[PDB]
Design a protein around this ligand. Structure first.
Ligand SMILES: *[C@@H]1O[C@H](CO)[C@@H](O[C@@H]2O[C@H](CO)[C@@H](O)[C@H](O)[C@H]2NC(C)=O)[C@H](O)[C@H]1NC(C)=O
Ligand SMILES: *[C@@H]1O[C@H](CO)[C@@H](O)[C@H](O)[C@H]1NC(C)=O
Ligand SMILES: [Ca+2]
Ligand SMILES: [Ca+2]
Ligand SMILES: [Ca+2]
Ligand SMILES: [Ca+2]
Ligand SMILES: [Zn+2]
Ligand SMILES: [Zn+2]
Lengths: 423, 424
């Protein structure tokens, strides 16, 4: 592995789940919205500890009930419904509520013995981080396991086969519905999922949700501080935090904090102390305010020469045209010769500098290095020296990232090559 | 501790539960607004319930099914108690007037409050107000829903929940009091015990009546021990069938067999013509003989008019209806027929005293037809002070009227509000 891979695997995971309940669910629970939410909370309350054994904390960030009419056409075909649900999420849900993954809890019966369906490895994706689960049984922990199963597939896991085991009982990723299903993941799932994160490093599961963005009732002992709680270190038997009274999820007497790089023996660290040290050339070691328990990640002032003077620090990162190119057209790609950027002087369709409202502005002679990026899909053959990455859905994609080095001591700001405001 | 003869006879008779099933609006939506998928689901369930009850000397037969696909006929709610009550009441006022049946179960896709997944009246079997149950289509696995349904029918059939000491083996039993998934298809000894006692004590008559093959609306299933349309015989599975006249695989009579069952069937062949198949059970009955062309034994009686019960009355379609008996059937033991004078109130054509209804009016009796109107009885209570006492129902004004073929005069019996002459 690499320094970034292993560093990622270590980071605590979080799945900001958005749950949707269809019109059949609303009817199923006697047209009582509270009853439908309580059902979803019960389900999440089971999913959460299940995913703790996988270094993931499922947090309910959104909830919606189609008590008026379904936003899509929920149907017997699991395939059609899933497709319809994902798209609706991509185009309607995400636009008004950010979240990492959505699950449709429907009361309809899917054709066949299947109780759910989901996109393999679609986690975090704006178009595929979705799954559908049939509220197939009165016993909610079984519905919970099914949803955890679909979430599993989203997380790169495949059905358990031959050798795979987790004990004397079926595991979450078992191929079919078994009422003896346990809450454990098999070694195989452990592995396939490990590999999966190693291969794609989905960024959205690193963001811990604010304790105020989590809409499910607080659960003391689920390893996550929620509204109404000062700390959560698990049950009293497993709680290792001496600052936390595990029984009440409240700080013990005399404690100001429990966790944080700015907490120490239940007390804030002195205003001045250093909590997090710089991770790279563009990051800067942080300090505690003596007042808060948290450590704000401050970065090295933007415009700081970085990556062997091939760019400049921009909010903790070092944007480089070369990286952008290899990121847009894969390995081997290189930045197009300078003459190619003259195409940004057209303000035509793909070549322009910025957007007033929706109207494209052409790059002035000195700003061509800040409009559309030009690369050379490196096959030494490729005759055409200029190539761009364009998207109809979002025209910004393919433009030179802000803060990108466009000349000595110069980086793009808003479609303009301007001098670093640093020495 | 002892067991009467009629009890033993009752216990031995084959039992049938003519079942009516109703699926609600949520079921309709749940299975994609597809009527076929909903019916198939119900057939599947019944295909599981039937073998569960055969072990109890009962054949469950689906004689009706209704899917509330437009709107629910009652307000199906999350409270099982309300729903059951609304369902039984709708069965009584609406369904029973449209199709006769022994028991109805509501299969809803709604979730009942709490852990319960069904509710039904204890010992309500055959009762026009209480033979009902409701069940949640609580699991994708239909055989579990079937078990839930057999549990409620179980309660209707007088069984209670299994106490911790009750067993039927390893797995939990049908009457287990809690919704579980290891659920087996067998009744625990406690259930079998409670069921027997229930039967002995109440002898519910409706489950003695076999439904016609054409009354069954569920697709025929060869091997369920019941001869359905398209079948000629059914002795169960091939590997367990012992009836030699039947091909347990095609439910067709074996080559060379004319029949498989019947009072007039013997060793797979029709009994000889004139062979007696049913002795007379009483004076108004006539022994019956086979035809040699059928396995059935048509039951006929003496001709309507022959004296009976010591000149009490005259045989009417196999029975001897006499006022004395009717007075006891309506008011209980001790009840006696009223003094002739009492029947005079039939001469007023009033609200309860008449002889018959012409169009919808009430034709009073003529002095001669005074004993073919409202039956007048009077109980043996010493504190009773009334000579004439009538039985009446707003629902059926006909109820409590003298029964057909009842001896009103000497050689005369009631036919229609008129004390006609016997010989007719
Ligand atoms: C209504 O639902 C029924 C399910 O019972 C569907 O019929 C099944 O269709 C599949 C197609 O592969 C067959 O294999 C089954 O044998 C059918 N079942 C029976 C017994 O009919 C039917 O397709 C649905 N109708 C509509 C309009 O979708
Ligand atoms: C709605 O459901 C909630 C939670 O199950 C319950 O507490 C409440 O009483 C219900 N409302 C009614 C009266 O149906
Ligand atoms: Ca908590
Ligand atoms: Ca920092
Ligand atoms: Ca049959
Ligand atoms: Ca006879
Ligand atoms: Zn799966
Ligand atoms: Zn019960």
């Amino acid at each position: 592995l690499t320094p970034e891979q292993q560093r990622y695997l270590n980071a605590k995971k979080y799945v900001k789940l958005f749950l949707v309940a269809d019109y059949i669910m609303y009817l199923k629970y006697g047209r009582n919205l509270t009853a439908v939410r309580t059902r979803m909370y019960d389900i999440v309350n089971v999913i959460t500890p299940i995913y703790h054994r996988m270094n993931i904390h499922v947090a309910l960030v959104g909830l919606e009930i189609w008590s008026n009419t379904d936003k899509i056409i929920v149907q017997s075909s699991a395939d059609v419904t899933l497709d319809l649900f994902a798209k609706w999420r991509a185009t309607d849900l995400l636009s008004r509520k950010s979240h990492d993954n959505a699950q449709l809890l429907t009361g309809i019966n899917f054709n066949g013995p299947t109780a759910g369906l989901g996109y393999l490895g679609g986690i975090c994706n704006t178009m595929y981080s979705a799954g559908i689960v049939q509220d197939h049984s009165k016993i909610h922990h079984l519905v919970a396991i099914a949803m955890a199963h679909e979430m599993g597939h989203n997380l790169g896991m495949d059905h358990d086969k031959d050798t795979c085991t987790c004990g004397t009982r079926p595991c979450v990723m078992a191929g079919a519905l078994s009422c003896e299903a346990s809450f454990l993941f098999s070694d195989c799932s452990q592995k396939d999922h490990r590999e999966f994160l190693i291969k794609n490093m989905p960024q959205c599961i690193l963001k811990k949700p604010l304790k105020t963005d989590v809409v499910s009732p607080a659960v003391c002992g689920n390893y996550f501080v929620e509204v109404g709680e000062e700390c959560d270190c698990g049950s009293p038997r497993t709680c290792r935090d001496p600052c936390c009274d595990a029984t009440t999820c409240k700080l013990r007497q005399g404690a100001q904090c429990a966790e944080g790089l700015c907490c120490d023996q239940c007390r804030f660290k002195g205003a001045g102390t250093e909590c997090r040290a710089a991770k790279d050339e563009c990051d800067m070691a942080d300090v505690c305010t003596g007042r808060s328990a948290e450590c704000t990640d401050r970065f090295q002032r933007n415009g700081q020469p970085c990556k062997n003077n091939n760019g400049y620090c921009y909010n903790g990162k070092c944007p480089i045209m070369a990286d952008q190119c290899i990121a847009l057209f894969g390995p081997g790609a290189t930045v197009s010769q300078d003459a190619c950027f003259q195409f940004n002087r057209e303000g035509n369709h793909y070549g322009y500098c910025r957007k007033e409202q929706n109207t494209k502005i052409a790059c002035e002679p000195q700003d061509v290095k800040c409009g559309r990026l030009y690369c050379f899909p490196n096959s030494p053959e490729n005759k055409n020296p200029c190539n761009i990455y364009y998207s109809p859905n979002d025209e910004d994609k393919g433009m030179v990232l802000p803060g990108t080095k466009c000349a000595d001591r110069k980086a793009c700001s808003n479609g303009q090559c301007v001098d670093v405001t640093t020495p």
